[PDB]
Amino acid sequence: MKFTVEREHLLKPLQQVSGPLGGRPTLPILGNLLLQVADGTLSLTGTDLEMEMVARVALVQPHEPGATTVPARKFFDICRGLPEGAEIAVQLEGERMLVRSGRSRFSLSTLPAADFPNLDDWQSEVEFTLPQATMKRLIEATQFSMAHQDVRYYLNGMLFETEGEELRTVATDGHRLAVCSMPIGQSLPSHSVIVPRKGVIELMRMLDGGDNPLRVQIGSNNIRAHVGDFIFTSKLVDGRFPDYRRVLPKNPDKHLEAGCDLLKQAFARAAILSNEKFRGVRLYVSENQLKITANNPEQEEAEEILDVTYSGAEMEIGFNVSYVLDVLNALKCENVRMMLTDSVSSVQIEDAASQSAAYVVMPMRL
Amino acid sequence: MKFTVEREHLLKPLQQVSGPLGGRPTLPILGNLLLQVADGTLSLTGTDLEMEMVARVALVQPHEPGATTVPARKFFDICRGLPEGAEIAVQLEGERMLVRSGRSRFSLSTLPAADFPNLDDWQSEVEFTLPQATMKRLIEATQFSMAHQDVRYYLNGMLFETEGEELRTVATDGHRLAVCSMPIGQSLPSHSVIVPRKGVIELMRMLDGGDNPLRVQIGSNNIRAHVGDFIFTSKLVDGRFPDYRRVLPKNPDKHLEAGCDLLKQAFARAAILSNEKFRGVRLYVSENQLKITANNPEQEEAEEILDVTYSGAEMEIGFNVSYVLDVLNALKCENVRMMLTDSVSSVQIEDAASQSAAYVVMPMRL
């Protein structure tokens, strides 16, 4: 296996396939990349057994076919360290891979390609394409609400649902929920899968802004996402997600609208003097006014009063200010709508200007 | 106690005094600031019993005398959270401090001023002033070479030494050393003191980088620095600090000149394949040439060759590559000079264009 490639043509591909990886996987080879020259193409693959990322680079310089497995972080670090515009020449030599550029030379340890974990083939059942920025919006709107290492293992990832011509994400912790829905211009079967949170993370990071469409293929136990020269595959979480329809408030009749930043800043100051563990804050709503109060066990007390747009019945509600601040921080918009019912019902929060994303936070008795 | 002060006049002083205090020390009053209104000045003090920072802010608005202590981090976070141009009105109300600004109101717990640790008075035995820039240069040249937590406690700080008309710092961990001297235009007494690491950090932090001069007072067991409205006091460390004159190589006649950035990037690449614990590389010096090699327990190897200016005898010498990098990262210059003796002696490294700072690194047997 020989190839000579310009540094910059390797950097983005290396960075993408090092995503699954780690620097003691225990299983050593998981800390290696797989390099394959076949045809006029270098392919690079990294995996953690659950998911796999593969990148392809066109070889316009002379090459020879073959395959090996090298330490991913060492190889990336060498390529990154070499100067802007460097030509990088790579050669298999015995049990070692040689890397030369200018006056610099490296020989890395290898592990047999034949030994590199392969994900089983599987058949695609549902497919669609959509713009990258659309998938990226969908994930970023909701990712912060996934659980991390909950016993309820199906919460530790993100639901991707297709319905009508819409693709929707849903993430919940069991405490707060996020849902985002975008039209993507293709009639879709009605279908749900759960992508593991590590996979959501890798998917999110393969999306580079650009003009390359994302093609998605879903099978019974896998998902694959292909954009330009990058192909991501993951196992799905074999589990039953909650239904977000059962979580949204029922026709809330009390709408408050405020400046997102003014609201965020008020909650952020009040939060200083909230209970460190439970983070309860109280809202008092009244005609075009919101009062926020926080206390803590030391009986310190904050209070914020700000002008808002509200014409509903006066009411109080409590909730967790960290959850509310996470939503406000996700939204990044001019104005926010809080859809309220009473002191004993969840709140739904949205960009005043778009119903695409919606967030549900549960009431606290304070 | 009452005062009203514009956010932007309170923020910097608060950040300075509150910085190094925790959110929740065992001994709670050390987590508080002492606030004192007296004679048309607000004084803010923080301490950890070794060192103390005091800021003074002239009160140009109506105020009333008195003193209390409040949680440092919380008071800062409330003031920082308030909008630009906020006027902050504070008043002691029983045993709570009320902070009010716009329609935001906070009530903080207090501890009695009379319980706030008072550092003993002491006498100044040496005094000088210098430009803030000069102290910045002195500390930044050397701080990286201080030990972090050596059982030789005096190595964990920084020697400040007056000789003639110069101020000098020196830092060392017994393996590598930094020393930097600058002229300060006063005839000084020959004196040395050691400042603990935490004190060096604060000294650096207090340097806003305007041209308020710094005024330093040194006593038998303390140091004080005074810039603008800030006053920083620390205890000094006991023990016999090494004498850099003895660490500097006696006569490092072999002189090498190289581009600083080239040389850095070559060591940084080589280091990837050096032993993760011991970090050894080997330099081969020859006529106008430097070759750097590395290898690790995996038998992986790097080699860099670069052009340099050298006319001495050929020599081979091993180093801990992290030590060399640290020095090249600290030299923010075009060309570096290295000054060698032999394979078992230390190397001296300096800016080819300035002799103000010198760095000495002890060799490895590899």
Please give the backbone phi and psi of residue B211, each rounded to the nearest 5 degrees, phi first.
-120, 30
CB contact under 8 A, B77 and A272: yes
Put simply, whether B304 touches A (Cβ < 8 Å) is yes
A154 is in an annotated binding site: yes
Residues of A whose CB is below 8 A from B81: 265, 268-269, 272
Per CB-CB distance under 8 Å, the chain B contacts of A105 are 302-303
Instruction: Measure Cα distances from A116 to A35, A71, A123 in Å.
Output: 10, 12, 22
Give Rg (Cα) of chain A. 25
Rounded CA separation B159/B163 (Å):
12
Name the β-bridge partners of B194. B159
Tokens of A55: 């990148």
Resolution in A: 1.8
As a whole number of angstroms, the distance between CA B174 and CA B226 comes to 32
Identity of the residue in A81, A303, A304 whose CB atom sits nearest the CB atom of B265: A81
User: In Å, what is the CA distance from B243 to each residue of B178, B247, B341?
Assistant: 11, 7, 19
**B308 and A CB contact within 8 Å:** no
Q: Chain centroid to CA A276: how far?
A: 27
Task: Mark yes or no for CB contact A105/B303 under 8 Å.
Answer: yes
Specify burial of residue A37 (Cβ count, 10 A radius: 0-12, 13-18, 19+).
buried
Cα distances (Å, whole numbers) of residue B223 to B20, B159, B234, B236 = 18, 12, 6, 7
* Closest alpha carbon to A144 in A114, A171, A104: A171
B103 touches chain A (CB under 8 A): yes
Which among B192, B197, B181, B196 has a CA at the least distance from the CA of B243? B192
Contacts of A104 in chain B (CB under 8 A): 266, 269, 302-304
Rounded CA-CA distance B357/A3 in Å is 45
**H-type alpha helices, A88-224:** 132-142, 197-206
Q: Kindly report the length of chain B.
A: 366
Q: Is A149 annotated as a binding residue?
A: yes
Q: Which of A74, A107, A303 sits opposite B105 (nearest CB)?
A: A303
User: How far is residue A164 CA from its own chain's centroid?
Assistant: 24
Strand order in the sheet with A66-71: A66-71, A32-38, A41-47, A51-58, A230-235, A222-227, A213-218, A126-131
Amino acid at B294: A
Cβ within 8 Å of residue B243, ≥6 positions away: none
How far is B252 from A147, CA to CA, in rounded Å?
Answer: 61
Relative to beta strand B87-93, strand B96-101 is antiparallel
Interface check for B107 against chain A (CB to CB < 8 A): the answer is: yes
CA distances in angstroms from A305 to A314, B96, B103, listed in the order given: 15, 21, 5
Can you tell me the distance from the alpha carbon of B37 to that of B58, in angstroms, rounded to the nearest whole number? 10
**Residue B329, number of CB atoms within 10 A of its CB:** 12
- What residues of B are in contact with residue A265 (Cβ under 8 Å)? 81, 83
B288 Cβ neighbours under 8 A, 6+ residues apart: B307, B308, B309, B310, B311
B24 known ligand binder:
yes
**Residue A154 in contact with residue A197, Cβ under 8 Å?**
no
Chosen from B76, B96, B106 to mutate, greatest number of chain A CBs within 10 A: B106
A80 touches chain B (CB under 8 A): no
Q: Is B197 annotated as a binding residue?
A: no
Q: Which residues contact B300 (CB under 8 A, 6 or more apart)?
A: A74, A96, A106, A107, A108, A109, B273
Nearest residue on chain B to A75, judged by CA atoms?
B272
Residue of A46, A104, A52 lying closest to A72 (CA atoms): A46
Contacts of A74 in chain B (CB under 8 A): 272-273, 300
Hey, what domains does chain B have and what are their CATH numbers? Answer: 1-123 (3.10.150.10), 124-247 (3.10.150.10), 248-366 (3.10.150.10)
Q: Which residues of B touch A109 (CB under 8 A)?
A: 298-300
Interface membership of A250 toward B (CB under 8 Å):
no
Distance, in angstroms, between B131 CA and closest chain A CA?
38
Q: Which residue has the tokens 């990044």?
A: A332
CB contact (8 A) between residue B107 and residue A300: yes
CA distance A43 to chain B (A): 23
The per-residue b/e assignment along B113-138, b for 16 or more CB within 10 angstroms, e otherwise, is beebeebeeeeeebebebbbebbebb
**To the nearest 10°, the Cα dihedral for B312, B313, B314, B319?**
-70
Residues A197/A241, Cβ–Cβ less than 8 Å: no
Query: What CA–CA distance (Å, rounded) separates B342 from B314?
Result: 10
Q: Which residues of B249-264 are buried (b: 16+ CB within 10 A; e: fewer)?
A: beebebebebbbebbb
Neighbours of A235 (CB within 10 A): 18
Q: Do A77 and B108 touch (CB under 8 A)?
A: no
Distance from CA of B70 to the nearest CA of A (A): 11
List Cβ neighbours of A81 (8 Å cut-off, separation of 6 or more).
B265, B268, B269, B272
The residues facing A223 across adjacent strands are A218, A234
B232 phi and psi angles, rounded to 5 deg:
-120, 125
The amino acid present at B316, given as its one-letter code, is: E
What is the distance between the terminal CA atoms of chain A, rounded to a whole angstrom?
67
- Beta-carbon contacts of residue A160 (< 8 Å; ≥ 6 apart): A167, A168, A169, A192, A193, A194, A195, A218, A223
> Which residues, including other chains, have CB under 8 Å from residue B353's CB and lie 6 or more apart?
B333, B334, B335
Nearest-CB residue to A77 (from B77, B272, B298): B272
With an 8 Å Cβ cutoff, are B109 and A266 in contact? no
The secondary structure of residue B10, as a DSSP letter, is H
Does A24 belong to an annotated binding site? yes
Chain A neighbors of B325, CB-CB under 8 A: none
- Tell me how far CA of residue B63 lies from CA of B4, B9, B37, B107, B112, in angstroms: 7, 15, 8, 19, 20
Please name the amino acid found at residue B76. F
Find out whether A221 and A206 touch, Cβ atoms under 8 Å.
Answer: no
Residue A202 has, within 13 A of its CA and on its CB side, a CA count of 30
Is residue A247 within 8 A of residue A159, CB to CB? The reply is no
Cβ–Cβ < 8 Å for B47, B119: yes
To the nearest whole Å, the CA of A242 is away from the closest chain B CA by 37
Paired tokens of B19: 């910085």
For chain B, give me the number of helices (H) and strands (E)? Answer: 7, 24
**Chain B interface includes A305 (CB < 8 A):** yes
Could you tell me which residues are beta bridge partners of residue B44? B35, B55
Instruction: Report yes or no: A315 at the B interface, CB cutoff 8 Å.
Output: no
Helices and strands counted in chain A (H then E): 6, 22
Q: Are strands B357-361 and B176-183 parallel, antiparallel or unpaired?
A: antiparallel
Give the tokens for residue B264: 């850095």
Total residues belonging to chain A: 366
CA contacts within 13 A on the Cβ side of A107? 14
- The CB density around residue A145, as the number of other CB atoms within 10 Å, is 25
Whether residue B105 lies within 8 A of chain A, CB to CB, comes out as: yes
Strand partners, B179: B170, B358
Kindly identify which residue of chain A lies nearest to residue B273, measuring between CA atoms.
Answer: A74
> What residues of chain A lie within 8 A of the CB of B96, using their CB?
300
Any A CB within 8 A of B262 CB: no
Asked whether the beta carbons of A99 and A90 are under 8 A apart, the reply is: yes
Whether residues B104 and A266 touch (CB distance < 8 A) is answered with: yes
Judge: A109–B300 Cβ closer than 8 Å, yes or no.
yes
